Structure formats: C-alpha cells, structure tokens
Amino acid sequence: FKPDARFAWCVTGSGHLLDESIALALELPRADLFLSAAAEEVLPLYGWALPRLRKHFRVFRDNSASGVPVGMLYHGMYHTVVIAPATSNTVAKCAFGISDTLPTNMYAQAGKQCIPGIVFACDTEPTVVTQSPNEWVELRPRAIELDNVERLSRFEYTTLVRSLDELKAALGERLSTLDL
Amino acid sequence: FKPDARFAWCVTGSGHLLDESIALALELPRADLFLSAAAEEVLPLYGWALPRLRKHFRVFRDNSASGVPVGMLYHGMYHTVVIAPATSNTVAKCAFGISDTLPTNMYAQAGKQCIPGIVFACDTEPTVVTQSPNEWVELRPRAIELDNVERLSRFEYTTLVRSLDELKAALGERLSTLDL
Amino acid sequence: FKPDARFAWCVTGSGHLLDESIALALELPRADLFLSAAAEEVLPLYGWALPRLRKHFRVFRDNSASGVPVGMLYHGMYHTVVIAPATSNTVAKCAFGISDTLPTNMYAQAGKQCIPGIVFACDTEPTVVTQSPNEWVELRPRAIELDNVERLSRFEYTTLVRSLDELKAALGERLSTLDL
Amino acid sequence: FKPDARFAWCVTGSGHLLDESIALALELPRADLFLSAAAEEVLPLYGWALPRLRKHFRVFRDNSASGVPVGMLYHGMYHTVVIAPATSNTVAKCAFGISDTLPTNMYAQAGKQCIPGIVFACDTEPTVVTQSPNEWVELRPRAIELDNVERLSRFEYTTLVRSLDELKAALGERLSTLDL
Amino acid sequence: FKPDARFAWCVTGSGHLLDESIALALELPRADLFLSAAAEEVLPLYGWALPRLRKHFRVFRDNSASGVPVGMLYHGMYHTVVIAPATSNTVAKCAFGISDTLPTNMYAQAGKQCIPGIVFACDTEPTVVTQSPNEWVELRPRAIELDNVERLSRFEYTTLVRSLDELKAALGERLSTLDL
Amino acid sequence: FKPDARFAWCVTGSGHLLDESIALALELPRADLFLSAAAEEVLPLYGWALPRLRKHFRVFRDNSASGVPVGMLYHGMYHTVVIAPATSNTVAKCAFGISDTLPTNMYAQAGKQCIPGIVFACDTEPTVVTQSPNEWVELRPRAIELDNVERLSRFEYTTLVRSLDELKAALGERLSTLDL
Ligand SMILES: Cc1cc2nc3c(=O)[nH]c(=O)nc-3n(C[C@H](O)[C@H](O)[C@H](O)COP(=O)(O)O)c2cc1C
Ligand SMILES: Cc1cc2nc3c(=O)[nH]c(=O)nc-3n(C[C@H](O)[C@H](O)[C@H](O)COP(=O)(O)O)c2cc1C
Ligand SMILES: Cc1cc2nc3c(=O)[nH]c(=O)nc-3n(C[C@H](O)[C@H](O)[C@H](O)COP(=O)(O)O)c2cc1C
Ligand SMILES: Cc1cc2nc3c(=O)[nH]c(=O)nc-3n(C[C@H](O)[C@H](O)[C@H](O)COP(=O)(O)O)c2cc1C
Ligand SMILES: Cc1cc2nc3c(=O)[nH]c(=O)nc-3n(C[C@H](O)[C@H](O)[C@H](O)COP(=O)(O)O)c2cc1C
Ligand SMILES: Cc1cc2nc3c(=O)[nH]c(=O)nc-3n(C[C@H](O)[C@H](O)[C@H](O)COP(=O)(O)O)c2cc1C
Ligand SMILES: Cc1cc2nc3c(=O)[nH]c(=O)nc-3n(C[C@H](O)[C@H](O)[C@H](O)COP(=O)(O)O)c2cc1C
Ligand SMILES: Cc1cc2nc3c(=O)[nH]c(=O)nc-3n(C[C@H](O)[C@H](O)[C@H](O)COP(=O)(O)O)c2cc1C
Ligand SMILES: Cc1cc2nc3c(=O)[nH]c(=O)nc-3n(C[C@H](O)[C@H](O)[C@H](O)COP(=O)(O)O)c2cc1C
Numbered sequence A, B, C, D, E, F: 001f002k003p004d005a006r007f008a009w010c011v012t013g014s015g016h017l018l019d020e021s022i023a024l025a026l027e028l029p030r031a032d033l034f035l036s037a038a039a040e041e042v043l044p045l046y047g048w049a050l051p052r053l054r055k056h057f058r059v060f061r062d063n064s065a066s067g068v069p070v071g072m073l074y075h076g077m078y079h080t081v082v083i084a085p086a087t088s089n090t091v092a093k094c095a096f097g098i099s100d101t102l103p104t105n106m107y108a109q110a111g112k113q114c115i116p117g118i119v120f121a122c123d124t125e126p127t128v129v130t131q132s133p134n135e136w137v138e139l140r141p142r143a144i145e146l147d148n149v150e151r152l153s154r155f156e157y158t159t160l161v162r163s164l165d166e167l168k169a170a171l172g173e174r175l176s177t178l179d180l
C-alpha cells in the first residue's frame, strides 16, 4: 500500500446505528466514505447530509454502474475496506458474490486483491424501533438474514462484526497491524 | 401478581454498558433496583452513586447473606426479574445454580416460582477499553464465557439477550404481555 | 476417629424443613452444628435463634473466610458430616467442588479425608409456600437443581437423601455402622 | 506492557506448599502479591504474616467486592498472572468462570486480555498431613478436583502446573520469553 | 361436573404419613373419603377411627365387590380422585389395571372418564420405623415398587406425587384450575 | 514375613529429589538401602556418601551380576520394596521386565512373590536444573518416559507415585496395613 493509504469506509442505506458508525469513522486517522445510492437517501434523515459529511470526509457517491471509484484500490490507496452499517441487503449481496453497488463492488474487489474487509452486520438480533413515546415496533431477523451473516462471516480476508464494540475492536486490531 | 407489581431490576458489578442499562431502567413504568455488593462499588465510578439512583429508584443493597429482599417475590410484588448488565461472574453463577448474591438469589428464586427473567449478558463479543486517546485494551470473551451464556440461555423462563437493542425488545415484549 | 467423635451437622440458609431437620439433629447422641452465614440469618426466622440452639448444641458460626473450624476434622473429632437442610445454592457449590462457606468447606474436606457425608437436598420436587390462608406460591425445581442433585449424588463417600424419612434412614445406618 | 511490568502473584487460602511457593515468588525479579480473604487468614499460620510479606512484596488484600486492584491489568502493569498455591476452591471457580475473589478476578481478567496465567493446582495427588509424630491423615483428591484440574488446564493463555518443579519451569519459560 | 362437585379422596391401608394425609384432606373445601378394606383396619391404629373421620367427612367403606359408590362419578359428583396415602399394593394394582377394591375402582373409573387423579406413592425412598427409643427397622423400596411407581406415573390424567409437599402442590394446582 | 521384617528401599542414580527421598527413608521404623551401581556414584555428589548412609542404614551395594542380596526376600526379611528416586532408566527396565541391576532385580523378584512395591517415578513433569544464579536448563519428559510410567503403573502389586507427597501417602498406607 501507499505510505499514506487510507480506510475505505462504505456506508449503506441503514438507519440502524448509523450515527454511531459515522462517529467511529470520525475517530480514524484517515478515512474516505463510499456511499450506496440508498445511503445517500438515508444519511440526511439521521443527521448526516452530504454537506456535513464533506466537512469531515472525502465522500464518493454511487454514481456509476461500474463502480469507478473502486479503481483506487488498484493503486494501493486503501489498506482496508469497512462496511458499516451494512444493510441486510448488502450483507446478502456480499454473501452471494453480487457486486452492483459501490459498497458491494468495493468489498468484492478488496477480496480479490486480498485487502482486509470489516463488515458490521446489523441484523443479528431483535431490536425495537419507536414512533411515539408509548408505541414501537419490534424487528426480528429472519432465517435468511442469520444464514447470510453466517455465510459472509466465512469469507476470506473478512471480519464480520455484530456490534459497535466488536467493530471498534476490529478497527483497533487493524490499526495495530498497520502500526497506526 | 399484585395489581401494582414491578420490575425487579438487578445490577451487577459491570462497567460495561452500565450507564445505558440504567437509562433503559429509567424508562420503565415501575422498577426497583437490586444491587450486588460489587455493583455498589462499581456504580459510583460510572456516574450512578446510590444517592443519584435513589432519586429515581427504590434501591436494595446486598447486605444480607440470605438475600432477604427476595422474600418480596413471594408476595407477588415483582412480575419480572432483569439482570442488566450481568457480569461474566453472575452469568456463571446463574448457569450453575449458584445463588450467593442478591442478584443471583433474585434470579434463582424467580425461576423456581416461574417468574420470567431477562438477562443481559455482556461477554459475548470482543470489545475495546480505552485509557488514553491513543492507547486501549482489547477484551475477548473466553470459551468459558461463551459456554456459560449458551448454558444460561437454555434455562426455563429465561430470555438471555446479548445487546442493548435486544434487551429493549425483551422488555417491550414483557410490557406488551402485561398490557403495560 | 477419637472415641468420643461426633456428628458434624451443617445447616444452610434453608427454611425448608428446617425445624424438622433440627429436630432430627436433637435426637443424635453427640452432634455439633456448623452454620453458613445465610443459616445464621434464616434460623431465627423459624424458631431456632442461636441462643436456643446453644441450649442443645455447640454451634460454630461461619466467621472465617478459610473455614477454620474444619481443622477439627484433622483431629478425628467428627466421624460424619451432614448438611441438612441443604439449599440449592449449597448443593450447587458442593457439586462443582466450590468451598467458600463453612458448610461447603466441611463437606469438601470430609470428602478429601474419606469421611462419610450425608446431604439432604431439598429441591427435588414441587412444593407450596403459603402467605395467607387462601393464597400460596408453588415452587418447582429447575433443570439445574435436578441436574446438580444428580451430580452430587455420585460423589465419593456421599449419601444424597431427598426426604426427612431417607435422612433418618441414612443417619440410622451410620449409627449402626459406628455401633452407636 | 509497561517497561517495568511485574508478575501478579495471587495467593489463596492453601497451606499446601505455601512456604515453598512464597520462596519461589521471592526469587522473581519483580512481583506483587494479591491475596484472597482466606489467604490472609491462612498465611500467618505458616510463617507468612502480612508484616513479613510486606518486607519483600507489595501486597494487595482482598478488601473490595469488585476486585478493584485488577484495574492495574488495564494499565499494562502486570505481564503475567500466577496463582500459587491454588486451593481446590479457587481451581473450581476458575474452571467455571466464577470470579468473586481477588485471585479469581485477576485470573479471569487476565484471560479476557490475553495475559498469560500460570496456575499451581495442589489437589492432583494423595498427600499426608501430620498432627503428632506417629499420627497423620491421608488426603485424596476427589473426582471433582481431578475433573476441575482437567477443565482449567484447557483454558486459553493458561499453564496449569501440578508441582513446584513444574511451576519453576513455567516461570522460567515466562522469564525467557520476556527476556528477563 | 356438578356446581358443588367434590374431591374423591381414597385412603388405603398405609400407616405411612397417614395422619399428615388426612390433615391435608381436612384443609380441602369439599372432600369425601373412600376407604379400602385394609384402610378401615389401619386407620383406627393411627388416630383416625371411623367415628372421628365422620365428624369431618362423608366416609364410604369398601363393602361391595363391585365398588358401588363409584357410580357417583357418572353423575359429575367428583371433579378429582386422590389416593393418599397409597400402599405399594394399591400402586401395583393401579399400574396393571386391576380394580378390585374401592380405591382402585375409583381410580380406574376416573381414568376411563378423563377425571384427573392424584396418587401419593409412599414407597419411593428408604425410611425408618421405630419400636423402642433405641431400636428401629429400616425399610427400602424394592425394584418392583420403584418400577410400579414409574409405570403408574405415565398414566393418562394422573399426577403421581412422592411427598407431602408435592401432594400439596398438585392439590393446589387442581384448586387453581377449578377456580376454588 | 518375619516379625521384624523391614522395608527394602532401593536407590537409583537419580539426583532428582534424592536428598528428600533419603530423608523420608530415615523416618521409617526399619529400612535397609539397596543401591544400583549408578546410585553409588551419584549419592556422594548430593550429600549422601556411603559412610554417611551407613550411620543410619544397612546398605547393600550392587556388586554382583545376579543380584545376590535379593535372596533375602525368600526369607521373609522384607515386607515391601521401594524404589525412590527411580531414574527414567530404572522405570523403563521395570516396565519391560528387565532385571540386571540390584534395584530392578529387587523389584522383579518382589513382584513374583507378591510383595508390594512402591515406585517413585521422577520423570512425569517438566523441571528446572540450575547451574548459575541466572542460568538454568529446563528438562521435559519425553513420550517414552510418560508411556513407561503408564506401563509400570499397571503392574501387579505396584503403587507408582509421582511426588514426594504421594510417596509419603503410599508409605503411610503400607505402615497402617502392617500395623506399624
Ligand atoms: C423504510 C425503513 C426501513 C427500516 N429498516 C430497518 C431495518 O431493516 N433494521 C433496523 O434495525 N431498523 C430499520 N429501520 C429503522 C431505522 O433504521 C431507525 O431506527 C429510525 O428510527 C427509523 O424510524 P422510523 O422507521 O419509525 O420512521 C427502518 C426504517 C425505515 C423508515
Ligand atoms: C429511512 C430508512 C432506513 C432504513 N434502515 C434500514 C436498516 O437499518 N437496515 C436495513 O437492512 N435496511 C434499511 N432500509 C432499507 C434499505 O435502505 C434498502 O434495503 C436499500 O435497498 C439498501 O440498499 P443498499 O444496501 O445498497 O445500501 C432503510 C430504508 C429507509 C428509507
Ligand atoms: C477491574 C476492571 C474490570 C473490568 N472488566 C471488564 C469486563 O470483564 N468486560 C468489559 O467489557 N469491560 C470491563 N472493564 C471496563 C469497564 O467496564 C469500563 O469499560 C470502563 O471504561 C473502565 O475503564 P478502565 O478499566 O480503563 O479503568 C473493567 C474495568 C475494570 C477497572
Ligand atoms: C471498575 C470495575 C469495572 C468492572 N467491570 C466489569 C465488567 O464490565 N464485566 C465483568 O464481567 N466484570 C467487571 N468487573 C469485575 C466484577 O466487578 C467482579 O467480577 C465482581 O466479582 C462481580 O461480582 P457480581 O457479579 O456479584 O456483581 C469490574 C470491576 C471493577 C472494579
Ligand atoms: C427469600 C426466601 C427464599 C425462599 N426459598 C425457598 C426455596 O428455594 N425452596 C423452598 O422449598 N422454600 C423457600 N422459601 C420458603 C421458606 O423456606 C419457608 O417455607 C417459609 O414458610 C417462608 O415463608 P414466606 O416466604 O412466605 O415468607 C423461601 C422463603 C424466602 C423468604
Ligand atoms: C427466609 C429465607 C428462607 C430461605 N429458604 C431457602 C430454601 O428453603 N431453599 C433454598 O435453596 N434457599 C433458601 N433461601 C435462600 C438462601 O438463603 C440463599 O440462597 C443463600 O445464599 C444460601 O446460602 P448458603 O447455601 O451458604 O447457606 C432462603 C432465604 C431466606 C431469606
Ligand atoms: C481447615 C484445613 C484445611 C486443609 N485443607 C487441606 C487441603 O485441601 N489439601 C492439603 O494438601 N492440605 C490441607 N490442609 C493441611 C495444611 O495445608 C497443612 O498441611 C498444615 O500442616 C495443616 O496442619 P493441620 O491440619 O494438622 O492443623 C488443611 C489444613 C486445615 C487446618
Ligand atoms: C489452616 C488452613 C489450611 C487450608 N489449606 C487448604 C489447602 O492446602 N488446600 C485447599 O484446597 N484448601 C485449604 N483450606 C481451605 C480453604 O482456605 C477454603 O476452602 C477457602 O474457602 C479458600 O478460599 P480461597 O480459594 O478464595 O482462597 C485451608 C483452610 C485453613 C483454615
Ligand atoms: C404390618 C405392617 C406393615 C407396614 N408396612 C409399611 C410399609 O410398607 N411402608 C412403610 O413406610 N411403613 C410400614 N409400616 C409402618 C407403619 O406404617 C407406621 O410407620 C407405624 O409406626 C407402625 O409401627 P410398627 O410397625 O412398629 O408397629 C408397617 C407397619 C405394619 C404393622
């Protein structure tokens, strides 16, 4: 990798722990953001519109079908790919080798080049989504979500994490490895 | 249970997600706190000294060897027992039927009376503990921690949860069941 | 054993059949009582405060972390160890080789010296606890209680009994063996 | 670890080979002692009262329920945890992930942080305890003691040793690794 | 069942826990007694002669070969059949479908009509029978007694209980079911 | 055996725990020493030259190819054979039925006559041998040593012990059996 290589932090269209995920990315020494089309829609709804993101990050939008920004991986510009948060959709696509979004292309190309990937899968446990003070909706991962997490966790050069704490740990191990 | 039955929320000597756990307890309609001896030492270190807790809760300290406050379970005063956060130590004791602290006695007696228990086990995944801005310690659960979580998760009338989100979901299901 | 060796009768913090257990101990030719910390709290609630016990027995309280009174086993002063009643907690500790109370230390040290132990396990069957004339609570042993009884029943030099009648029988066999 | 990191040598309430264990600790370049409550009672009976220990060691007593001194592990102050001698009780607690004493908390926290532990289990073989010149008591480990030693010996980052000689060897290997 | 349906409490010729069994029957809201021929002989020997029983109960003697009083089951007069205490003899007869006494006919006819039966089997554990202050006889259940208890415990609409405590629990569950 | 029968204590050319082994032999009521050729060379190096040994013991040197002193076993002069310490070499020879030294002949002939043998095998665990204050050598038993210990431990009339404590226990049991 180049001496000043960076984290490639991909964001998908997940509202789940989105703010906390960006908060962690903010703590990293050098990271650029790579968005899916859905992320670009979802991020403004949770406090992270593009103009705010660009105060802190270089931000690459998903505006090509071929995933043109992934070409930077060939130039040693990114030492690690992160997907956080990862929608169930993106976990499914990664697990089956589908790459038709910027984050799934970044992940697949990283793997082909033996670049470490860290994937924060957010559908491993039940959760609660509230609308009013005394009304809420419980979400429960389905068999397919759980199976896809298991599938992806077995991938080469991939650390699948299931919580913010574990994401922090994976990032910390990567930083230690890179002597950063 | 009595018409005005409450949550029995037990706290153990865990700094891990302690503040967020108390925050959830604060949201419940009626809950009393039951501390281990270690909790009484640890809680003040993280912003929850007894005088602050007592502004919001009835608080029972672990000051008897026999677990005298557990007698209230026999009077239909508590419809649910929670342990959150639960130290690895308390998960181990619960898993093997040891009850020599107020929280482990509350849990065991609940089970014998078929009162639902919800246990927030905090040692299921790696995590990071920081001391200085650029120095930190990674913790990793051992086989025994993982095995004990598996053991306890199989207990009658017990919902073992592994995250704050899942704890919220379990609490929400309980509230729905009780029509609260 | 010394010519005038005695029964070492350990009491734990169990209200269950406590009065009947002490009644049986009273019938034995020479027995001393060894209490857990919880027993010292529970016994007065059921008619057996320390001053009443001391009219009939030498009574050893659990007031050392190391279980100092157990040293008397090394001097041939006790030919038999009894635990009656035994809490689920003490059955669990005995079953896993934990000895951090006077009764569990007495039991473990007895075993290491091949001194017969008799353990009255009180959580083998459902029971009823009453509060008012027409209101009561049913207790039901959990899998862990049943499993721990099975575990402990297999121990060397150990007779696990599940009723007062069977405790009487075990005591009677011991008396016959000792020609008392 | 810090440049001047030390051995964390835990002592439990075992009279067995206690004097020889302290003798070995005395030979180590830098070691602090961490006592259980039972150790504090037992040590004076065998020639090692606290004032004598403190001529040679920093000594931490077990005077908190939460195991406050273990916090020093997070600061890289101890490169190794030793438990020697280890009572059957402490071996049992370690084997099942119970940590409610200073030594068992030191051991568990070491493991979670991948700090090497060395445990001198003293109940692996029959032994003789004498009272008078021509009278003595044979002790024999029970199945549960032997099983617990086997269990603990399989733990991550743990070297279970069964003799003083093997403890010396383990310490020597650790010193060689640390280039001390 | 009729609105004022009763317990049909059968007594067999067992001296074992007979007084305590009648004591429990006395606590039930509405119960009639149904005796075997042997019960009629044994009951007076233990404090419960027919005239004393009839101060508290309607009492049906076993004075017909066909078990004429069992006809009352067809009229919805009894919501539950109890046998307590049950001799080994009556447990054996029930287990093999033999009905040639009033209690065994009550039990079999209850089963055919899907009326719940509760059977207190008294030969599951060793016990002691005393004659003089320092002389006694130990009884031990044989394989056939243990096997027959296992057999009967599997019967439809049957709760086999092995202690007074468990009998109380079964009765309590029945009362709760019947909203009594 | 003769009324004044003795222990036949064999010594091999082991420096390991040699001084402590002789110390135990000194405590026995009546024991004679039987040396291998290697023992006669090694003993003076560790404080036990023949003239010192002969102040306390009758000492038989290995100065015949046929093991002439073993003839005393035929005359009921020795009730027990001990080998302590036993070199790996002597454990190997005993395990395979080789008897071409005084100790291995004493052991084999004892076995053929059903005379109890106690063998202190010293190669069951790693150990440390020091030369200078800060330099030492670790020894580790090989598979063949461990296998041979297992083999010999299965021999008729043989108690294989792996520590000084266990040797003391075996000797104590023998003394108790012989009412000495
Ligand atoms: C269309 C939509 C889909 C969502 N899907 C998920 C999901 O798959 N998993 C999840 O944990 N939360 C999901 N959420 C919840 C958001 O991530 C987040 O919690 C936020 O509070 C949304 O609030 P709201 O759905 O009530 O409008 C979803 C929200 C929306 C609007
Ligand atoms: C406000 C909002 C919040 C959402 N949150 C989630 C979520 O937390 N997890 C999830 O799997 N999908 C969530 N979705 C649905 C995804 O955006 C949707 O599946 C999309 O196709 C994901 O595409 P992507 O994986 O390429 O980013 C959300 C949708 C909306 C509109
Ligand atoms: C003695 C001690 C034990 C701890 N044990 C754990 C643990 O088992 N699991 C965990 O997630 N955090 C553990 N922590 C971390 C605290 O829960 C919490 O994260 C806090 O930040 C402690 O900061 P500090 O250890 O650096 O002093 C422990 C902290 C201390 C002092
Ligand atoms: C400041 C501090 C923080 C701690 N945090 C944790 C923790 O997050 N998880 C854990 O298993 N133990 C933690 N410990 C250790 C426990 O307090 C210790 O094991 C204690 O025996 C637990 O007892 P309890 O389960 O009855 O509450 C901590 C200790 C201290 C002093
Ligand atoms: C805190 C507490 C725990 C008890 N635990 C048990 C138990 O595990 N098993 C049991 O048979 N009885 C148990 N009991 C019941 C007492 O042993 C005894 O039956 C007595 O009647 C207690 O009355 P009470 O609980 O209504 O106050 C418990 C009672 C209390 C107060
Ligand atoms: C009034 C009272 C009665 C209790 N009765 C029982 C009981 O019958 N059985 C039981 O397992 N625990 C019972 N407990 C709970 C035990 O006292 C508790 O588990 C304690 O930790 C036991 O410690 P020990 O085994 O060392 O004596 C009771 C507690 C109280 C306050
Ligand atoms: C209460 C007590 C418990 C003991 N437990 C053990 C033990 O579990 N294992 C052991 O090898 N020695 C044990 N010992 C023996 C001491 O560790 C030590 O050998 C010392 O000589 C004790 O002498 P004494 O028991 O005759 O008073 C115990 C001694 C006492 C007093
Ligand atoms: C004088 C004395 C010596 C003891 N020696 C031993 C011993 O050698 N081994 C052992 O397992 N227990 C021994 N015990 C019993 C332990 O001290 C007891 O089990 C205690 O609960 C251990 O607690 P700990 O493991 O936290 O230190 C001894 C007790 C006394 C009073
Ligand atoms: C003929 C006879 C048979 C008995 N059978 C039993 C029995 O099978 N099981 C039992 O627990 N007790 C049995 N007992 C004991 C009585 O139920 C009861 O305990 C009473 O104390 C009888 O005293 P006794 O036999 O010494 O005369 C029997 C007693 C007698 C006389």
Ligand SMILES: Cc1cc2nc3c(=O)[nH]c(=O)nc-3n(C[C@H](O)[C@H](O)[C@H](O)COP(=O)(O)O)c2cc1C
Residues within 6 Å of the ligand: E011, E012, E013, E014, E015, E016, E036, E037, E038, E039, E042, E045, E086, E087, E088, E089, E090, E101, E122
């Ligand atoms: C005084 C006395 C007490 C008895 N106690 C018992 C007993 O406790 N258990 C038992 O199985 N048989 C006992 N028997 C024997 C039974 O009465 C005998 O087996 C009889 O045939 C039982 O008939 P039944 O089951 O129809 O009532 C006792 C007999 C007598 C005379």
Ligand SMILES: Cc1cc2nc3c(=O)[nH]c(=O)nc-3n(C[C@H](O)[C@H](O)[C@H](O)COP(=O)(O)O)c2cc1C
Residues within 6 Å of the ligand: F014, F015, F016, F088, F122, F127, F129, F130, F131, F139
């Ligand atoms: C030739 C020789 C062989 C030895 N073999 C062993 C052995 O097989 N096992 C052992 O525990 N010690 C062995 N030792 C060590 C001695 O038994 C003893 O520990 C003593 O301290 C020897 O010191 P030194 O070897 O440094 O000269 C041996 C020593 C020597 C000189």
Ligand SMILES: Cc1cc2nc3c(=O)[nH]c(=O)nc-3n(C[C@H](O)[C@H](O)[C@H](O)COP(=O)(O)O)c2cc1C
Residues within 6 Å of the ligand: F011, F012, F013, F014, F015, F016, F036, F037, F038, F039, F042, F045, F086, F087, F088, F089, F090, F101, F122
């Ligand atoms: C000073 C010295 C110490 C020795 N210590 C040991 C020892 O501790 N264990 C061992 O297996 N061999 C040891 N040996 C090697 C044995 O003496 C050697 O294998 C010899 O052949 C043993 O013969 P033996 O079994 O008939 O006595 C030592 C040798 C020397 C010179």
